[PDB]
Write a protein that binds this ligand. Structure first.
Ligand code: NI
Ligand SMILES: [Zn+2]
Ligand SMILES: [Zn+2]
Lengths: 129, 127
């Protein structure tokens, strides 16, 4: 058994893909656009879907946005240097909600970004987790 | 770089753990109280955290529930036999929903399990 993917709904799929690929260096693993169902799916990640869990982004062509609640948390990504990843996001015009630094009560170097839809991305510096 | 985990907030950690460990056969990899923040984290998965992405569960001690929006989709898991997993989940009293005709799943009918907090788990049969 294995975890295959986490799925999120996005208002603008191209804006979403630009964040994941440009700010986070993920690659587009697979994209499928169904005119019969009026939706598109896009799987983004770092390794092939056969090898690791991916992020699935869904866009319903006739929806203009979604309502976020407080149940869903975040997607966490392991990074070489959290300050460097933050500075890249900032330079690209994306939201850094918590700059790289030690976790409130711990020794892990963490940062938080928000993607264009407002979903939280937790960055955890390698070795510190 | 790699994906480390997806995090969901849970109203009752013990109920959530009962679902992920018994209905889904996940292993409790790590769990820790953070008394200063008044929360407990639990990490459930199938492989070691250093090797694969896990599911992080947050239980806030002063909360009884969460307001779910319509943005979050589901977590998908690969299973040996979906029919066996569904039957096992139903025996345990969890809701199973099945969807036919999903364009991205070809001829397959896809089962979704509902966890105690109402989060959906998509079952994808291996092969
Ligand atoms: Ni986390
Ligand atoms: Zn899925
Ligand atoms: Zn699906």
């Amino acid at each position: 058994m294995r975890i295959l993917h986490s799925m999120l709904r996005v208002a603008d799929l191209e804006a979403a893909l630009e964040f994941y690929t440009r700010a986070l260096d993920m690659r587009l693993l697979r994209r499928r656009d169904y005119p019969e169902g009026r939706f598109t799916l896009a799987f983004v990640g770092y390794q092939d879907e056969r090898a690791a869990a991916a992020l699935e982004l869904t866009h319903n062509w006739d929806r203009d946005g979604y309502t976020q609640g407080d149940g869903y948390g975040h997607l966490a990504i392991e990074v070489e240097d959290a300050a460097v990843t933050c500075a890249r996001a900032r330079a690209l015009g994306y939201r850094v909600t918590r700059e790289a630094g030690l976790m409130q009560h711990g020794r892990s170097v963490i940062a938080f970004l928000e993607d264009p839809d407002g979903y939280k991305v937790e960055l955890i510096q390698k070795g510190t987790q």
